[PDB]
Ligand SMILES: CC(C)C[C@H](NC(=O)[C@@H](NC(=O)[C@H](CCONC(=N)N)NC(=O)OCc1ccccc1)C1CCCCC1)[C@@H](O)CC(=O)NCCc1ccccc1
């Protein structure tokens with residue numbers, strides 16, 4: 001099938017997000033945007049902003065675009081149930097990280113060009129930032145590109161507009177995140193990228209307009225750490241640096257990642273203390289004890305030493321020896337989550353990128369996308385996963 005391919009840039013340790021370039025307006029102004037399957041808006045600062053940080057590109061200049069239209073209110077009223085303030089339809093977006101971006105809406109021409117020179121254009125309603133706070137003030141990306149789906153009487157989103165204006169493509173997009181940059185694919189997924197070929201693992205979405213799936217358990221050394229009787233409904237969110245899970249599952253995983261974190265390999269006491277542990281030593285016993293020792297001995301043998309950074313986040317010198325995690329999907333299929341995904345590159349170490357959820361919002365984030373193709377099958381309401389050799393940029 002026809003696949004249009006766009007370059008993604010970024011990383012987990014320094015940017016904390018991945019981003020792409022799109023052209024906005026006539027003549028085009030190149031604007032870099034965080035790729036976020038967890039939000040619906042497309043927005044960035046606009047010239048004349050007074051409460052905005054400095055980003056890779058200068059604020060979008062509405063006066064230089066022959067095709068921009070500020071969405072002024074008619075009869076002090078606004079389409080899409082938006083609110084009128086000071087003559088313009090107000091843009092206002094809060095994120096779970098705590099950030100609140102605000103300003104006003106405008107429309108202009110959006111232009112998306114693959115690196116094979118294939119181009120989709122359309123008009124989009126977009127937000128001008130007149131106020132930024134929190135991480136937005138200090139990030140390098142100029143704005144955010146929400147990748148979620150349009151609602152019945154809501155603002156048509158980028159993804160829906162993109163496919164409405166490229167009927168030559170199948171309604172599927174794929175995100176291929178590597179350690180540095182990656183690729184966005186419109187039209188399907190690339191089987192050439194699959195490792196070896198392994199089979200795509202499919203899961204049904206659980207809400208009509210957002211990307212959620214049900215995770216029925218999470219195993220380490222054959223042992224389910226998830227306490228949830230029913231499932232967890234998890235957002236599949238490329239705009240979330242880390243994966244976020246309940247505190248109890250977090251503390252169990254951390255209990256064994258600590259055992260596997262040895263800060264000084266020449267302390268024979270500490271190494272011997274660990275190698276002496278039995279199934280009975282643990283707070284929580286394991287069903288695959290033999291696999292735990294296989295991992296522990298591999299770490300000791302290769303001298304894969306560990307340092308703890310801010311908050312007891314373990315960082316190993318090698319991927320070698322760390323265990324696989326296994327995510328139980330609704331199939332009862334147990335999907336492999338390897339160290340080259342859930343660890344992320346920070347300088348010369350590999351650091352764990354798994355955090356406590358907040359607000360009761362579990363999230364599958366960038367450390368779950370990494371070194372995978374994540375396949376958003378819009379027409380069939382499913383999301384697919386397969387291990388992949390994702391492009392890198394730079
Ligand atoms: C780019 C980002 C702003 C997009 C949203 N992501 C988020 O809000 C998340 N943020 C993140 O992962 C951020 C992403 C990048 O930083 N943000 C900006 N550059 N602007 N990562 C991050 O905070 O990493 C930790 C950290 C980074 C840097 C310094 C110190 C600590 C999560 C949310 C859950 C708790 C942890 C933080 C988005 O994906 C989710 C969202 O808020 N969507 C809006 C609508 C909605 C409402 C309710 C539920 C679901 C969706």
Ligand SMILES: *[C@@H]1O[C@H](CO)[C@@H](O[C@@H]2O[C@H](CO)[C@@H](O)[C@H](O)[C@H]2NC(C)=O)[C@H](O)[C@H]1NC(C)=O
Pocket residue numbers: 279285286287288289290
């Ligand atoms: C580690 O200990 C647990 C708990 O004793 C073992 O799991 C139990 O195994 C018995 C059979 O001997 C079952 O009747 C229990 O229902 C099991 N409980 C749980 C929570 O699994 C486990 O097999 C031990 N692992 C090893 C490798 O010996």
Ligand SMILES: *[C@@H]1O[C@H](CO)[C@@H](O)[C@H](O)[C@H]1NC(C)=O
Pocket residue numbers: 204330331
């Ligand atoms: C997933 O969705 C398809 C399409 O409607 C349906 O036929 C199938 O039974 C669903 N499977 C699960 C496990 O929900």
